[PDB]
């Protein structure tokens, strides 16, 4: 199936990307016209 | 989506929707007109124009400006919000700038002197006025 | 008899199921996102039905083949 | 770039929400990758034996 290590790495990358994207969303929100 | 299921109808809410839709039609038309005018000026005024294709492009640009003016008059008269003053001002300024740039290009491509720096400055001023119009058009 | 017949080679080599599923699913998901985005950002005056229908059809098609191949890859072999 | 503010905003909100959902559903999935999918501890063995009946 999928090694535990693989799943953990995927979880880490997804979480970090999601948090950076949330920050980017806050920047876009403030920048509204 | 096709089911209204609304008991009370309010005029201001529908007015906002229609005004936004009109402002979308207008913005799309302005973008298309700038793209067309710029493409025609770049593909018909390279080294030889003969004042034939340039005249057709000027006629097409005048027709597009007339359609945009008709849409602006429709949004001014029919709708409740003004949405006309800034729109009409930007439309008049863009039409005048496009006519002046087309005249300068047709004069530089059909004369003894080849204007290169003057044409670049005219294109930069046109792009600056277009950027100001896009900043004012929200 | 049995000699006349020959080994039943599968139409799709199984080793290609994962990659084939991925691309199809990706494309299908992207189309679905587009449809939902279009649904959210559209007023009543500007809702082209032809566009909606076409995007829906393509999305569903890809999503269907995607899910099927994904299921197959999981080893259920429906 | 060319995309309007509305479309961009909603596509970001939707992207982030979907990612978050997948993240949550795929981080409480450790006890299954290691050992096969079997219910564990003292309580889930009654709820299971009841939902089955």
From Swiss-Prot, chain A:
The chain crosses the membrane at residues 5-25. The keyword Transmembrane applies. It is a single-pass type III membrane protein. Pathway: Protein modification; protein glycosylation. Belongs to the OST4 family. Subunit of the oligosaccharyl transferase (OST) complex that catalyzes the initial transfer of a defined glycan (Glc(3)Man(9)GlcNAc(2) in eukaryotes) from the lipid carrier dolichol-pyrophosphate to an asparagine residue within an Asn-X-Ser/Thr consensus motif in nascent polypeptide chains, the first step in protein N-glycosylation. N-glycosylation occurs cotranslationally and the complex associates with the Sec61 complex at the channel-forming translocon complex that mediates protein translocation across the endoplasmic reticulum (ER). All subunits are required for a maximal enzyme activity. This is Dolichyl-diphosphooligosaccharide--protein glycosyltransferase subunit 4. The lineage of its organism: Eukaryota, Metazoa, Chordata, Craniata, Vertebrata.
Swiss-Prot record, chain B:
Expressed in all tissues tested. It comes from the Eukaryota. Ubiquitinated by the ECS(ASB11) complex. Ubiquitinated by RNF128, leading to degradation in a proteasome/lysosome-dependent manner. Ufmylated by UFL1 in response to endoplasmic reticulum stress, promoting reticulophagy of endoplasmic reticulum sheets. It is found in: Endoplasmic reticulum membrane; Melanosome. The modification N6-acetyllysine is found at residue 82. Residues 2-138 are cytoplasmic. Component of the oligosaccharyltransferase (OST) complex. OST exists in two different complex forms which contain common core subunits RPN1, RPN2, OST48, OST4, DAD1 and TMEM258, either STT3A or STT3B as catalytic subunits, and form-specific accessory subunits. STT3A complex assembly occurs through the formation of 3 subcomplexes. Subcomplex 1 contains RPN1 and TMEM258, subcomplex 2 contains the STT3A-specific subunits STT3A, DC2/OSTC, and KCP2 as well as the core subunit OST4, and subcomplex 3 contains RPN2, DAD1, and OST48. Belongs to the OST1 family. This is Dolichyl-diphosphooligosaccharide--protein glycosyltransferase subunit 1. It comes from Homo sapiens. The gene is RPN1.
Curated annotation (Swiss-Prot), chain C:
It is found in: Membrane; Endoplasmic reticulum; Cytoplasm. The chain crosses the membrane at residues 16-36, 54-74. One of its GO terms (cellular component) is oligosaccharyltransferase complex A. Disulfide bonds: none annotated. Pathway: Protein modification; protein glycosylation. This is Dolichyl-diphosphooligosaccharide--protein glycosyltransferase subunit TMEM258. Subunit of the oligosaccharyl transferase (OST) complex that catalyzes the initial transfer of a defined glycan (Glc(3)Man(9)GlcNAc(2) in eukaryotes) from the lipid carrier dolichol-pyrophosphate to an asparagine residue within an Asn-X-Ser/Thr consensus motif in nascent polypeptide chains, the first step in protein N-glycosylation. N-glycosylation occurs cotranslationally and the complex associates with the Sec61 complex at the channel-forming translocon complex that mediates protein translocation across the endoplasmic reticulum (ER). All subunits are required for a maximal enzyme activity. Belongs to the OST5 family. InterPro entries: TMEM258/Ost5. It is a multi-pass membrane protein. It comes from Homo sapiens. The keyword Acetylation applies. The gene is TMEM258. GO terms for molecular function: oligosaccharyltransferase complex binding. Coiled coil: none annotated.
Swiss-Prot record, chain D:
Mn(2+) binds at residue 43. The record marks 43 as: Interacts with target acceptor peptide in protein substrate. A motif (DXD motif 1) lies at residues 41-43. It is found in: Endoplasmic reticulum; Endoplasmic reticulum membrane. Expressed at high levels in placenta, liver, muscle and pancreas, and at very low levels in brain, lung and kidney. Expressed in skin fibroblasts (at protein level). The chain crosses the membrane at residues 12-32. Residues 1-11 are cytoplasmic. Catalytic subunit of the oligosaccharyl transferase (OST) complex that catalyzes the initial transfer of a defined glycan (Glc(3)Man(9)GlcNAc(2) in eukaryotes) from the lipid carrier dolichol-pyrophosphate to an asparagine residue within an Asn-X-Ser/Thr consensus motif in nascent polypeptide chains, the first step in protein N-glycosylation. N-glycosylation occurs cotranslationally and the complex associates with the Sec61 complex at the channel-forming translocon complex that mediates protein translocation across the endoplasmic reticulum (ER). Belongs to the STT3 family. This is Dolichyl-diphosphooligosaccharide--protein glycosyltransferase subunit STT3A. It comes from Homo sapiens. The lineage of its organism: Eukaryota, Metazoa, Chordata, Craniata, Vertebrata. The gene is STT3A.
């Amino acid at each position: 199936m999928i090694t535990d290590v693989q799943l953990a790495i995927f979880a880490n990358m997804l979480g970090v990307s999601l948090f950076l994207l949330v920050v980017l969303y806050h920047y876009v929100a403030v920048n509204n016209p | 989506v096709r089911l209204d299921f609304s008991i009370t109808k309010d005029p201001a809410a529908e007015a906002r929707m229609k005004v936004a839709c009109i402002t979308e039609q207008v913005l799309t038309l302005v973008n298309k007109r700038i793209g067309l005018y710029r493409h025609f000026d770049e593909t018909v005024n390279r080294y030889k124009q003969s004042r034939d294709i340039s005249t057709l492009n000027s006629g097409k640009k005048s027709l597009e400006t007339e359609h945009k003016a008709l849409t602006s008059e429709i949004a001014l008269l029919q709708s409740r919000l003004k949405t006309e003053g800034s729109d009409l001002c930007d439309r008049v300024s863009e039409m005048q700038k496009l006519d002046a740039q087309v005249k300068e290009l047709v004069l530089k491509s059909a004369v003894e002197a080849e204007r290169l720096v003057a044409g670049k400055l005219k294109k930069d001023t046109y792009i600056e006025n277009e950027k100001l119009i896009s900043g004012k058009r929200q | 008899e049995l000699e006349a017949m020959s080994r039943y080679t599968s139409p799709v080599n199984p080793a290609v199921f994962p990659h084939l599923t991925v691309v199809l699913l990706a494309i299908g998901m992207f189309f679905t996102a587009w449809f939902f985005v279009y649904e959210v950002t559209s007023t009543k005056y500007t809702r082209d039905i032809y566009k909606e229908l076409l995007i829906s059809l393509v999305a569903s098609l890809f999503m269907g083949f995607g899910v099927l191949f994904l299921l197959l890859w999981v080893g259920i072999y429906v | 770039l060319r995309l309007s503010y509305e479309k961009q905003d909603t596509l970001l909100k939707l992207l982030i929400l979907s990612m978050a959902a997948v993240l949550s559903f795929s981080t409480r999935l450790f006890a299954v990758l290691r050992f096969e999918s079997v219910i564990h501890e003292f309580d889930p063995y009654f709820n299971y034996r009841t939902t089955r009946f």
